[PDB]
């Protein structure tokens, strides 16, 4: 069995290997990359996402989110308070202000220590989940707005044609902005490209051990667990590496820098934080190997998780028994 310790693998494809996206994902899996739940892909030196980032300041962040924490430093939830719209140029200036800027630090490990010590005492503002793309239309390789759609994959594998669309999302971050522990909708893959700025640190639980994280989460968030049998779908709970280690939960960590791709694999729980002002682009995707994970994915039916239009068909076709209850949650 390849990668039996479920380590995060790092790949350096050549320009020739960067042509065929599906083939390269399948290669990485042949080497056991999925066992970690997360992989890093460093593009060939010939490649670029676009020519420059000099003209992005007028992008609008219609609903910036202030991430307010509750709990203790290693075990907390966050809620998202909506803020007034601002442009990317306004948000960059805000991120660099004395109130929000990254503190002085020695290295990524020192910064990580400072994040876990102090995150809860601040409320950073995240420009998350903005439909759009920063890939140039002429970028032919690993262009996250030109991937095969999940609807077409389902149709290719299973023969059923369904409604829905699959487009990318932009994330503008600042110091301490946080992504809570989650798997993707319908336990899909994700791919995330860090276009510019400061790094993003990731934590990940191997897919084969995801239920260990779920059991800890039920223990640590006991009211939330009574509320919903899949409350990590709400994307609000944080658990630190120290707490994970104390509870024997297998995980790994890695820091993504600008110009790098990360892939999350089906049922790979992940969480993390931004080091300072940055911009990432991410989208979900599927492969043939996903189908069995989609059929088994948990679902939130309490009403909190509320998701895209396109998840309807995935539930309807892959999980017809759950469909009725899940849809009640959506309505
Ligand atoms: O970058 C973020 O805030 C969150 N991203 C992801 O969870 C991802 O790409 O799957
Ligand atoms: Mg602009
Ligand atoms: Ni994710
Ligand atoms: Zn729920």
Curated annotation (Swiss-Prot):
Catalytic activity: N(6),N(6),N(6)-trimethyl-L-lysyl(9)-[histone H3] + 2 2-oxoglutarate + 2 O2 = N(6)-methyl-L-lysyl(9)-[histone H3] + 2 formaldehyde + 2 succinate + 2 CO2
Record domain JmjC: where: 136-302
One Gene Ontology cellular component annotation held by this UniProt entry: pericentric heterochromatin
UniProt PTM: Ubiquitinated via 'Lys-63'-linked ubiquitin chains. Deubiquitinated by USP14 with the help of TRIM14 leading to stabilization.
Keyword vocabulary terms for this entry: ADP-ribosylation, Chromatin regulator, Dioxygenase, Iron, Metal-binding, Nucleus, Oxidoreductase, Transcription, Transcription regulation, Ubl conjugation, Zinc
Binding site for 2-oxoglutarate: 126, 192, 200, 235
Any GO MF annotation of the entry: damaged DNA binding
GO terms for biological process, alphabetical: cellular response to ionizing radiation; chromatin remodeling; double-strand break repair via homologous recombination; inflammatory response; positive regulation of chromatin binding; positive regulation of double-strand break repair via nonhomologous end joining; regulation of gene expression; regulation of protein phosphorylation
Positions bearing PolyADP-ribosyl glutamic acid: 16-17
Root EC class: oxidoreductase
Residues that, per the record, bind Zn(2+): 228, 234, 300, 302
Listed cofactors: Fe(2+)
Positions that bind Fe cation: 182, 184, 270
Localization of this protein: Nucleus
Cofactor-binding details, from the entry: Binds 1 Fe(2+) ion per subunit.
Record carries keyword Mitochondrion: no
EC number: 1.14.11.66
Domain JmjN span(s) in chain numbering: 8-50
Recorded family membership: Belongs to the JHDM3 histone demethylase family.
Main function: Histone demethylase that specifically demethylates 'Lys-9' of histone H3, thereby playing a central role in histone code. Does not demethylate histone H3 'Lys-4', H3 'Lys-27', H3 'Lys-36' nor H4 'Lys-20'. Demethylates both di- and trimethylated H3 'Lys-9' residue, while it has no activity on monomethylated residues. Demethylation of Lys residue generates formaldehyde and succinate.
The protein's name: Lysine-specific demethylase 4D
